[PDB]
Write an enzyme that holds these catalytic residues in place. Structure first.
Site, PDB file in Angstrom:
ATOM      1  N   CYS A   1       2.094   5.138  -7.299  1.00  0.00           N
ATOM      2  CA  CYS A   1       0.935   5.143  -7.252  1.00  0.00           C
ATOM      3  C   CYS A   1       0.083   4.985  -8.276  1.00  0.00           C
ATOM      4  O   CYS A   1      -1.076   4.329  -8.556  1.00  0.00           O
ATOM      5  CB  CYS A   1       0.894   7.327  -6.443  1.00  0.00           C
ATOM      6  SG  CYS A   1      -1.100   7.026  -6.048  1.00  0.00           S
TER       7      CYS A   1
ATOM      8  N   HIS B   1     -27.888   4.596  12.946  1.00  0.00           N
ATOM      9  CA  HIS B   1     -28.769   3.132  13.192  1.00  0.00           C
ATOM     10  C   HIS B   1     -29.194   2.853  11.297  1.00  0.00           C
ATOM     11  O   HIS B   1     -29.888   3.304  11.228  1.00  0.00           O
ATOM     12  CB  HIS B   1     -28.968   2.195  14.188  1.00  0.00           C
ATOM     13  CG  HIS B   1     -29.713   1.606  14.336  1.00  0.00           C
ATOM     14  ND1 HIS B   1     -29.044   0.108  14.348  1.00  0.00           N
ATOM     15  CD2 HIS B   1     -31.472   1.007  14.788  1.00  0.00           C
ATOM     16  CE1 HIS B   1     -29.848  -0.646  14.673  1.00  0.00           C
ATOM     17  NE2 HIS B   1     -30.723  -0.593  14.731  1.00  0.00           N
TER      18      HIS B   1
ATOM     19  N   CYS C   1      -1.568   3.113  -6.200  1.00  0.00           N
ATOM     20  CA  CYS C   1      -2.922   3.239  -5.769  1.00  0.00           C
ATOM     21  C   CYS C   1      -4.260   2.979  -6.407  1.00  0.00           C
ATOM     22  O   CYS C   1      -4.580   1.951  -6.319  1.00  0.00           O
ATOM     23  CB  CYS C   1      -2.717   4.588  -5.051  1.00  0.00           C
ATOM     24  SG  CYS C   1      -1.348   5.524  -4.831  1.00  0.00           S
TER      25      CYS C   1
ATOM     26  N   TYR D   1       1.234  -5.640   3.296  1.00  0.00           N
ATOM     27  CA  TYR D   1      -0.022  -4.923   2.883  1.00  0.00           C
ATOM     28  C   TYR D   1      -0.114  -5.343   1.121  1.00  0.00           C
ATOM     29  O   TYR D   1      -0.819  -5.676   0.316  1.00  0.00           O
ATOM     30  CB  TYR D   1      -0.195  -3.338   2.509  1.00  0.00           C
ATOM     31  CG  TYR D   1       0.404  -2.679   1.957  1.00  0.00           C
ATOM     32  CD1 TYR D   1       1.157  -1.804   2.167  1.00  0.00           C
ATOM     33  CD2 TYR D   1      -0.339  -2.278   1.128  1.00  0.00           C
ATOM     34  CE1 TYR D   1       1.763  -0.747   1.549  1.00  0.00           C
ATOM     35  CE2 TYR D   1       0.344  -0.833   0.074  1.00  0.00           C
ATOM     36  CZ  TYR D   1       1.497  -0.628   0.331  1.00  0.00           C
ATOM     37  OH  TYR D   1       1.863   0.638  -0.085  1.00  0.00           O
TER      38      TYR D   1
ATOM     39  N   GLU E   1     -20.772   2.276  13.815  1.00  0.00           N
ATOM     40  CA  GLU E   1     -21.652   3.056  15.354  1.00  0.00           C
ATOM     41  C   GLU E   1     -20.872   2.143  16.468  1.00  0.00           C
ATOM     42  O   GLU E   1     -21.296   2.431  17.179  1.00  0.00           O
ATOM     43  CB  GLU E   1     -23.181   2.881  15.313  1.00  0.00           C
ATOM     44  CG  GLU E   1     -23.962   0.986  15.276  1.00  0.00           C
ATOM     45  CD  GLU E   1     -25.403   0.674  15.173  1.00  0.00           C
ATOM     46  OE1 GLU E   1     -25.860   1.541  15.766  1.00  0.00           O
ATOM     47  OE2 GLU E   1     -26.171   0.302  14.041  1.00  0.00           O
TER      48      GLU E   1
ATOM     49  N   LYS F   1      -4.743  -0.691  -8.270  1.00  0.00           N
ATOM     50  CA  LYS F   1      -4.847  -1.348  -7.311  1.00  0.00           C
ATOM     51  C   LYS F   1      -6.299  -1.207  -6.786  1.00  0.00           C
ATOM     52  O   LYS F   1      -7.056  -3.155  -6.859  1.00  0.00           O
ATOM     53  CB  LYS F   1      -3.767  -1.418  -6.021  1.00  0.00           C
ATOM     54  CG  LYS F   1      -4.396  -2.875  -5.361  1.00  0.00           C
ATOM     55  CD  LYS F   1      -5.192  -2.389  -3.759  1.00  0.00           C
ATOM     56  CE  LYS F   1      -5.218  -0.283  -3.327  1.00  0.00           C
ATOM     57  NZ  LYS F   1      -4.123  -0.243  -2.753  1.00  0.00           N
TER      58      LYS F   1
ATOM     59  N   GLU G   1      -2.347  -8.104  -0.543  1.00  0.00           N
ATOM     60  CA  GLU G   1      -3.890  -7.075  -1.103  1.00  0.00           C
ATOM     61  C   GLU G   1      -3.922  -8.650  -2.999  1.00  0.00           C
ATOM     62  O   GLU G   1      -4.384  -8.455  -3.162  1.00  0.00           O
ATOM     63  CB  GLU G   1      -3.365  -5.596  -1.697  1.00  0.00           C
ATOM     64  CG  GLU G   1      -4.182  -4.598  -0.549  1.00  0.00           C
ATOM     65  CD  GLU G   1      -3.546  -3.802  -1.344  1.00  0.00           C
ATOM     66  OE1 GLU G   1      -2.755  -3.174  -1.699  1.00  0.00           O
ATOM     67  OE2 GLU G   1      -3.811  -2.427  -0.334  1.00  0.00           O
TER      68      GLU G   1
END
Ligand code: FAD
Ligand code: FAD
Lengths: 462, 462
Positions: free
Chosen positions: A42, A451, A47, A181, A456, A50, A185
């Site tokens: 990681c 909003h 992580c 993934y 939303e 990246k 990426e």
């Protein structure tokens, strides 16, 4: 000779360190064997490095909407070195922080490579020095898999995510091979930044284990971003020409005849085909510890291996390969062991996940088909919307935002939320909390909206 | 003469239109009186045109981190016109969409200005034409308040949010007067885009009704962004010099002596001091309809006025002034009226709100002091963190991210979440859903994190 502790953790990555922190914090005498750099995959090659590279690509993307927002455009020309040197310094600062906390919490760090011995009681040896403990956790994680010459001749000419983070200049022509993934990426960062990219997938779309809407939307957004998705294609061999590499790939669209084509002048060939566990050099055989056909360490619902006093968490188990899951399990364990919470185990249901593609994907729960199978078409109702973020209401370049909600039963319990769009990266955590409390659509629907936002849309689906 | 309907809605803004849509969708015969443009404040001069202007400022901000991310910088010079013309077209497209849906749902639009008559039964007249209905909803909303010459001489020389959206060039020197969300947002958009800005507040900080952390953090982030916060200051008078305006302001820091100072060469003076309701020209007096000292229409928990068959929702009531609340109440009402759900009313507890400052603020629930008062210091525990988004790990310019969680009682029920940082705009909706189901910190804490994100910080607070 065998120095004894209350807890011996093998590997200082995500699962490892969290387990040792919580453990010691509960009064134990821990040590953390680590053969390399603390933080594990990681932090050093995952992580963290990246995310920085992604942010950079996000900057590249928006450079495209500058004139649209009234500003003059920029001449372009990204400099890889600058951002790499920085990305690297960052990672060092992180490493320093990690040692600091470990020592600050009084956790030893046995530096070196651990491996179990031929002793009756579970014991490991690091540099002819043996250490034992009543509880040993294997948190060695995994590593990138590369194909051998024995199948794909010239396969060893390409790199992996690890060599991606070792790259010092922006490759001219990149070829990603993989449809998950990490592949996506890498495909998207490299492409955003300027490299000509081809993503080679054995099928028609990507992230195939993700809800159909996500894999379908993602394959499109990729194509619309300048990425070439080479469908139904694999590499037969790679040769080092003088220019670069020559990818000979077999493309066999079902319903047609196979056709081989060379990809020449390739600067980079990234193998993003999989992750194999780090278990061979542990001497698992010395204690007769159970593994599967692929080397993963077999463990139960409570992270228990088949041998008493030995547990395993994270990538090395081959289940839900994410930093937060290794952490969540290493933590639940230290509590089960040192706080005697016999039912302290991690629930692998409703684990949220964000894929940093462009736009970012977010997902938690069951895909529609995972629900239809578990519930039955009569009991599964989906809700979805597809709109354009108002950020694009003034831009020529557009992206979409598609959100799907899988509801189950009469009350319509939200069993799965899947979306891809701008802001979907920070949008997910909360709905992931809501999905875990067992929220029904009405709970979502009786939530006054915010909003103007993209979020939303999830609480007004109809 | 009086044409009769099942529902007469006065005003085609947020509350109005939602009530009419749901209402007709439930089989009623609605009409919507509107004297201007459908969509109301929000669409024409609020939420929508504000969000676009904000995005634009966000672009300006990040232009500052370009070289940091490896890209060359840009010469600058934002062109206001370009983005204004577009912002405007967008709003037109929205208007066209609104008429379309209204007609598509068979809702009449009585164009013109409505006002109640001197008739026994509730009746209103639009252009000598009278219309009546067994249920009439006043959804006239409010308007910007400006000070009169009778107190601040030369007060009428400045503008309001309405005139902000009418502006065609970027003002050279802007002076915002007001310490609430609209003021802050205007302060931040104008400043990001290049105008020299001074925010004039009667106290030491802004958004004073927000949790102390938020008002304290927000005043700082504003100051750090190039905005001048003129604390403990008000305008005594404004004069139209030849250059621009001359703001004579009294600054009286408590503990010192008052000091008057002129602000010269001001291009813009924005009054962001308040919103007064639209009720005077309705002839509320004709039916003896109850209002408060400020003109707001007094209504009960179910939006009922004191007169049977007349209701009011949104800004005009003076409570929770937001598009989503007007919508939420107009909707709950149409169901109560036409679906006979006698308990269909909106809960004004836990309404989520995002303030589009830089970075964006997000909040739902009780401020710490609102909890301490309702629970007692013995029963209120807060958790908070302050970190720097990793987006800044490579930039020289930084912003922070501060998140606070107000928990109450033994189980630690999350009664308030307040934060300000990057992504806090899309981060909120879900936690707002969670906060409404009555989530406890453990619910948040038993949610596998999403890494690397800013949101994960909320589910790992300790
Ligand atoms: C590209 C890329 C991007 C990723 N991005 C993300 C992301 O954004 N989000 C996410 O959540 N996850 C991400 N992951 C997954 C995440 O990195 C892993 O899930 C996490 O690293 C798993 O931790 P672990 O505890 O099992 O192992 P690891 O962190 O891999 O750690 C094991 C540690 O043990 C050491 N070691 C191994 N064997 C021994 C032994 N015999 N003796 C001594 N020390 C040993 C290793 O050196 C290592 O440092 C990414 C992976 C790659 C590759
Ligand atoms: C700057 C600025 C930014 C804002 N930003 C946001 C934001 O980002 N988010 C948010 O959620 N809220 C925001 N608001 C608040 C939101 O705009 C209002 O809450 C929302 O507009 C309230 O709706 P309403 O139904 O009460 O009234 P309105 O939308 O104001 O509508 C009333 C309508 O009735 C018409 N009318 C009035 N009287 C009569 C009469 N006698 N006869 C006929 N027609 C009549 C009006 O012309 C109007 O179009 C903002 C306001 C301003 C000013």
């Amino acid at each position: 000779a065998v120095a004894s502790y209350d807890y011996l953790v093998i590997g200082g990555g995500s699962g490892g360190l969290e387990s040792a922190w919580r453990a010691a914090e509960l009064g134990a005498r821990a040590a953390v064997v680590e053969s390399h750099k603390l933080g594990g995959t990681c932090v050093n090659v995952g992580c963290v490095p990246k995310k920085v590279m992604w942010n950079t690509a996000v900057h590249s993307e928006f450079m495209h909407d500058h004139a649209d927002y009234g500003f003059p455009s920029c001449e372009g020309k990204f400099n890889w070195r600058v951002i790499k040197e920085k990305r690297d310094a960052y990672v060092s600062r992180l490493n320093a922080i990690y040692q600091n906390n470990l020592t600050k919490s009084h956790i030893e760090i046995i530096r070196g490579h651990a491996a179990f011995t031929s002793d009756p009681k579970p014991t490991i040896e690091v540099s002819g020095k043996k250490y034992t403990a009543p509880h040993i956790l294997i948190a060695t994680g995994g590593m990138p898999s590369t194909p051998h010459e024995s199948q794909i001749p010239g396969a060893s000419l390409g790199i992996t995510s690890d060599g991606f983070f070792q790259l010092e200049e922006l490759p001219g022509r990149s070829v990603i091979v993989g449809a998950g993934y990490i592949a996506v990426e890498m495909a998207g960062i490299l492409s955003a930044l300027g490299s000509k990219t081809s993503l080679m997938i054995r099928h028609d779309k990507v992230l195939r284990s993700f809800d159909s809407m996500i894999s379908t939307n993602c394959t499109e957004e990729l194509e619309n971003a300048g990425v070439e998705v080479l469908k139904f294609s694999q590499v037969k061999e790679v040769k080092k020409t003088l220019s670069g590499l020559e990818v000979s790939m077999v493309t066999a669209v079902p319903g047609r005849l196979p056709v081989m084509t060379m990809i020449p002048d390739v600067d980079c060939l990234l193998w993003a085909i999989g992750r194999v566990p780090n278990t061979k050099d542990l001497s698992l055989n010395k204690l007769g510890i159970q593994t599967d056909d692929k080397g993963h360490i077999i463990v139960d619902e409570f992270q228990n291996t088949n041998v008493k006093g030995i547990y395993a968490v994270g990538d090395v188990c081959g289940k839900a390969l994410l930093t937060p899951v290794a952490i969540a399990a290493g933590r639940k364990l230290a509590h089960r062991l040192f706080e005697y919470k016999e039912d302290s185990k991690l629930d692998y249901n409703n684990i949220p996940t964000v894929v940093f593609s462009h736009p970012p994907i977010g997902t938690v729960g069951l895909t529609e088909d995972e629900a239809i199978h578990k519930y039955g078409i009569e009991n599964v109702k989906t809700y979805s919307t597809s709109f354009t973020p108002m950020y694009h209401a003034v831009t020529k370049r557009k992206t979409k935002c598609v959100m799907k909600m899988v509801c189950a039963n009469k009350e319509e319990k939200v069993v799965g939320i899947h979306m891809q769009g701008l802001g979907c990266d920070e949008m997910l955590q909360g709905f992931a909390v809501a999905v875990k409390m067992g929220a029904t659509k009405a709970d979502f629907d009786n939530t006054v909206a915010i909003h103007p936002t993209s979020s939303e849309e999830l609480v007004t689906l109809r």
